[PDB]
Amino acid sequence: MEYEDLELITIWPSPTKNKLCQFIKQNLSKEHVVTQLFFIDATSSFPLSQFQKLVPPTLPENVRIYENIRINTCLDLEELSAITVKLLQILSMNKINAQREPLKIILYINGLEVMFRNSQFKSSPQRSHELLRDTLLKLRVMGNDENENASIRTLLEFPKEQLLDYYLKKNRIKNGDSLAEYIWKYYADSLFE
Amino acid sequence: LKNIRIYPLSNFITSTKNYINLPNELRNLISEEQESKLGFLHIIESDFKPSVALQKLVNCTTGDEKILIIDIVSIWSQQKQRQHGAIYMNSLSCINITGLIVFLELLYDSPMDALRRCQVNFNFQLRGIVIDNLSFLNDVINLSKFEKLFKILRKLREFLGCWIITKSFPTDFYNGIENTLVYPTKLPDSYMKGMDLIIYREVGRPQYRRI
């Protein structure tokens, strides 16, 4: 999966550790652009062990890759909203400074269903849904910006078991959509297996 | 004698307003006379992306005609999706109802200034405004905000002559994740009462039905 082919928001169900690593390697290795990975996780589970095996930090061509991966542990929607603010600042300033090389940001979020759950228990269902909505719609507008100096694309990881609506549509009792299904139906452009 | 009214026929076949042309997929829903006077259409559908019928309703221009698409969902204005007869508003200043109302009030007051925010030469006729998706704008506060929204859209139709098409999701969207939030859509009558035609799309066969 090349950056240029990514949709504004893409769901990636249960990626293997090797596939995640290769995706990161291929994209951050692109010449003539600065590609960065912001990995935002509720469980602090970036596969560091596999990544170091496939992309050894001891090899010269790999130094910049490690320098352009940013890691964050994010426990709730309020923290994710703050991270989105920071990303928009980075993008906005890059665009401005670009006339005062091109920046390509991949925002990769794992465990969004647990951030949502956490927020929901600290606030309300209504507030969590409004914060989720506000953050996703903002990331779409950000990714949709025609500007060529700086771009963002968002990838959302979910376990396949939270996307049964998708797999069974191929071709079970259920009490409403999982967060993954909700996003699949209402916020994401596509889902990549 | 003083009160006698004699009208030229050309009055009855001429209008200062644009009307919506229903595609074949939506014909047979309303009268003949009713389709002739469609100014406000609301569509309820589960699709995040626009259904084929909605696509046909838009991208219906010819020559200098343009449709203003207020793209709250960032779909229509995506580079691979843009069409020649559309003008797009896709801005962080217009993804909530307060910002939306501010923009539409400017469009009414000073179309040129509003349209400049959509990066538009002004050699064209504005035929229609589309808003996608109203469900993302969701106590008695929303009844008032939506009434204000409808009132400004109606003023815009009166002044500019554009038709108005809006979309929302069905009630199932309003149930929320795992039903934690628990017409077949959740918009106030304050808005729905103003529609000339309300259409509901229920899907493996998609069926368009009038409400």
Curated annotation (Swiss-Prot), chain A:
InterPro entries: Csm2, P-loop_NTPase. GO terms for cellular component: cytoplasm; nucleus; Shu complex; site of double-strand break. Pfam families: CSM2. It is found in: Cytoplasm; Nucleus. GO terms for biological process: DNA recombinase assembly; error-free postreplication DNA repair; maintenance of rDNA; meiotic chromosome segregation; positive regulation of single-strand break repair via homologous recombination; recombinational repair. Present with 414 molecules/cell in log phase SD medium. Belongs to the CSM2 family. Component of the SHU complex composed of at least CSM2, PSY3, SHU1 and SHU2. This is Chromosome segregation in meiosis protein 2. It comes from Saccharomyces cerevisiae (strain ATCC 204508 / S288c).
From Swiss-Prot, chain B:
Its main location: nucleus. It is found in: Nucleus. Signal peptide: none annotated. GO terms for cellular component: cytoplasm; cytosol; nucleus; Shu complex; site of double-strand break. It comes from the Eukaryota. Keywords: DNA damage, DNA repair, Nucleus. Pfam families: PSY3. GO terms for biological process: DNA recombinase assembly; error-free postreplication DNA repair; error-free translesion synthesis; positive regulation of single-strand break repair via homologous recombination; recombinational repair. CDD domains: Psy3 (cd19480). Present with 876 molecules/cell in log phase SD medium. Component of the SHU complex composed of at least CSM2, PSY3, SHU1 and SHU2. Required for resistance to the DNA-damaging agents methyl methanesulfonate (MMS), cisplatin and oxaliplatin, but not to mitomycin C. Plays a role in protection against mutation accumulation. May be a component of the recombination-repair pathway. This is Platinum sensitivity protein 3. The lineage of its organism: Eukaryota, Fungi, Dikarya, Ascomycota, Saccharomycotina.
